[PDB]
Amino acid sequence: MLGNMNVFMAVLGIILFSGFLAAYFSH
Amino acid sequence: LFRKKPIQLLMKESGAKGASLRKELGAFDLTMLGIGAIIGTGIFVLTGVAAAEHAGPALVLSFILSGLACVFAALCYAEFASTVPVSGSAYTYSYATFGELIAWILGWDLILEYGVASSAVAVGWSGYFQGLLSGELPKALTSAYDPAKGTFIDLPAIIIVLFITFLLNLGAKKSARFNAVIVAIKVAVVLLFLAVGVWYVKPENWTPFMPYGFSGVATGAATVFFAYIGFDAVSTAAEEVRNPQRDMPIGIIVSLLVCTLLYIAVSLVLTGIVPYEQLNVKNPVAFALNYIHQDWVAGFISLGAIAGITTVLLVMMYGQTRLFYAISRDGLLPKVFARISPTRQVPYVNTWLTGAAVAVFAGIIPLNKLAELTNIGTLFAFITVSIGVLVLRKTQPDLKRAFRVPFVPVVPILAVLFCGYLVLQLPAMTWIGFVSWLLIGLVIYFIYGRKHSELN
Ligand SMILES: CC(C)CCC[C@@H](C)[C@H]1CC[C@H]2[C@@H]3CC=C4C[C@@H](O)CC[C@]4(C)[C@H]3CC[C@]12C
Ligand SMILES: CCCCCCCC/C=C/CCCCCCCC(=O)OC[C@H](O)CO
Ligand SMILES: CCCCCCCC/C=C/CCCCCCCC(=O)OC[C@H](O)CO
Ligand SMILES: CCCCCCCC/C=C/CCCCCCCC(=O)OC[C@H](O)CO
Ligand SMILES: CCCCCCCC/C=C/CCCCCCCC(=O)OC[C@H](O)CO
Ligand SMILES: CCCCCCCC/C=C/CCCCCCCC(=O)OC[C@H](O)CO
Ligand SMILES: CCCCCCCC/C=C\CCCCCCCC(=O)OC[C@H](O)CO
Ligand SMILES: CCCCCCCC/C=C\CCCCCCCC(=O)OC[C@H](O)CO
Ligand SMILES: CCCCCCCC/C=C\CCCCCCCC(=O)OC[C@H](O)CO
Ligand SMILES: CCCCCCCC/C=C\CCCCCCCC(=O)OC[C@H](O)CO
Ligand SMILES: CCCCCCCC/C=C\CCCCCCCC(=O)OC[C@H](O)CO
Ligand SMILES: CCCCCCCC/C=C\CCCCCCCC(=O)OC[C@H](O)CO
Ligand SMILES: [Cl-]
């Protein structure tokens, strides 16, 4: 645990960063 | 017939299996276990077909009714995981409370349910893998189940089962950190659809709210019930949990309550983007993003769905294999053996055979039938456990309970009534497969099942 919480939180943020980025560059 | 299994005996078997195993897992790790087993084909695929042909925009109420039936049921499972903190679900609980006859019926029912659920999961996975690839497209006749025009087999659904069957046979030990990675991939992609999809929601698509009436909300609820199956999997990790009496109830209820909210939000955003009449698609969530020209985000969500639905498939097949190892140890089914070392033989379950059975049904049976057949078996298992809490409060009332169902008779009764109501909403032909399977099992008990490890 703890590391598993941080690991979870970090990938949400990575995907939500990449997602919001790609969403901005669309018609 | 109703010869109960003493809880002391269930503690000994769990205490012998989990003696070597290391304990680290807490409430967070078990919520991940739960979410991993819950978010899958149900929300990613069934949601589209169900809104288009059963409820329409009112699929949100169809998620509430269905969601309430599972909350009342999950509360019962949490009292059971708190009282009997052993690595096992419904089969073990019925054996301790009701006895051998009820535990055998339910047990034999779940052998089918976990198998049929895997096929339904793999069929859903295929539609997202096929959708992602186009943009490519394989041979037209190897894309779906056998109908009257085109397709003969759903090859991607056959293939993914064989890949999962190869992984479980490789014997690669599970990593709680690796599970936190995949579950976050699944949770983040859902949130991404919500966050991006909210901007394009036309409230006009919601206006004909209940086109099929409340009758449609009820049949819709019986379909989308499938999406909630999976909270029972938190009991798997019991031999790896420090303090399972209070962490497993947390995992079960929290993972469920989290998914219920995501499910209500997905229903609104989906029917909000695409008019209900256009959502009968193999990949509704990817389709809604493509519909509103968010092609890049749609592929990114298709990737998350592929990786995320795969963990649902692994759980289902493992839960079935574990179930076969439990029934045979109890003597209710014969014992298979295989050499783990050139000179040391141990009990075995043929996963190649159990996986081949799943692969066939995944390649020839349409998703709807598979889902409807999982729903009947699961609803009857849920009803049985709900009454189990009541029976365990009457017989054996002195037992230690760190978690207790809030209202002693009312909540377990409500779960029986809500599930009971959803059973009456399934097609009549769904009963042909389910009943005939139970008659086969009932015959097995009188011929073989009475030659077991409790006759003595
Ligand atoms: C937490 C949530 C609610 C906020 C963050 C959402 C992110 C995904 C937002 C921030 C700015 C948004 C963009 C803002 C403006 C437009 C133009 C319009 O045609 C709608 C879509 C589009 C192209 C949006 C797509 C999604 C977007 C990139
Ligand atoms: C409400 C609007 C939506 C906003 C959505 C916000 C949530 C996404 C979070 C992103 C940051 C993720 C990375 C930071 C968390 C992981 C690191 C951490 O917790 O601690 C650091 C270290 O690991 C200690 O040892
Ligand atoms: C780190 C080194 C990687 C080297 C690359 C080669 C290994 C390929 C691994 C694939 C992941 C699958 C691992 C198998 C997980 C099995 C899980 C299991 O046994 O049961 C299900 C569990 O209880 C509930 O999900
Ligand atoms: C009572 C609610 C309490 C919760 C508070 C959470 C606030 C999160 C941030 C919102 C700002 C972004 C709003 C994005 C809304 C979608 C766009 C929309 O509604 O309309 C289109 C827009 O007005 C023309 O471009
Ligand atoms: C990570 C955070 C994700 C948060 C996700 C939100 C939660 C889900 C809410 C759904 C109800 C949506 C109601 C909003 C209605 C907005 C109407 C709108 O945008 O209309 C514009 C136009 O009519 C069409 O193009
Ligand atoms: C021992 C055997 C005794 C015999 C009894 C076995 C039960 C047969 C049930 C048939 C369902 C018939 C369904 C007919 C199609 C109507 C579907 C419909 O619209 O149903 C609405 C609602 O459920 C009101 O039936
Ligand atoms: C769909 C069928 C096609 C599947 C194609 C898969 C790719 C196979 C390639 C290389 C094997 C990697 C060998 C290099 C890794 C060495 C370490 C090792 O053997 O790891 C195994 C792990 O520890 C326990 O699973
Ligand atoms: C390029 C070659 C790379 C090397 C080859 C790597 C194999 C392919 C990667 C991932 C397998 C994904 C399969 C899904 C894994 C699910 C794991 C899971 O949930 O395991 C149980 C968990 O650890 C406790 O709950
Ligand atoms: C929430 C909206 C859905 C968005 C997706 C979020 C995913 C978050 C992942 C895991 C939850 C971690 C566990 C939740 C921590 C709260 C535990 C709690 O409520 O109580 C603990 C205990 O029972 C004393 O009351
Ligand atoms: C609310 C209606 C349902 C719509 C769906 C939810 C929309 C809200 C979006 C993001 C919540 C944040 C999600 C990030 C997960 C946090 C994981 C975690 O560890 O949470 C515990 C605590 O909050 C750590 O500070
Ligand atoms: C609902 C009506 C539809 C009914 C559908 C019936 C499907 C029968 C198909 C294949 C059986 C062959 C595959 C299963 C072989 C089991 C082997 C196994 O598990 O061996 C270990 C043993 O059980 C340790 O006790
Ligand atoms: C001998 C008894 C053995 C048990 C036999 C149980 C038969 C199924 C029971 C009820 C549903 C009957 C109708 C089934 C087909 C229609 C689908 C449905 O249930 O409801 C449709 C809804 O009412 C409008 O859309
Ligand atoms: Cl365009």
Numbering used by the authors:
A (entry chain C): 1 to 27
B (entry chain A): 3 to 137, 141 to 461
From the primary publication:
Crystals were eventually obtained in the presence of l-Alanine and cholesterol doped monoolein, and diffracted X-ray to 2.86 Å. GkApcT adopts a ligand bound inward occluded state with solvent filled cavities extending towards the bound ligand from either side of the membrane. Clear electron density was observed in the structure for the bound ligand, l-Ala. A conserved aromatic side chain on TM6, Phe231 and threonine, Thr43, on TM1 provide the main steric occlusion that seals the binding site from the extracellular side of the membrane. In contrast, intracellular access is less obstructed, with only a thin occlusion separating the ligand binding site from the solvent filled cytoplasmic tunnel leading to the inside of the cell. This thin gate is constructed principally from hydrophobic side chains on TM8, Met321, and TM6A, Ile234 and Glu115 on TM3. The amino group predominantly interacts with the carbonyl groups of Phe231, Ala232 and Ile234 from TM6 with one interaction to Ile40 from TM1. In contrast, the carboxyl group interacts with TM1, making polar contacts to the amino groups of Thr43 and Gly44. In contrast, in GkApcT we observe the α-carboxylate group of l-Ala interacting with a well-ordered water molecule, in addition to the backbone amide groups of Thr43 and Gly44. The maps were of sufficient quality to allow us to identify this helix as YneM, which has recently been renamed as MgtS, a single spanning transmembrane protein from Escherichia coli. In our structure, we observed density for a cholesterol molecule in this pocket.
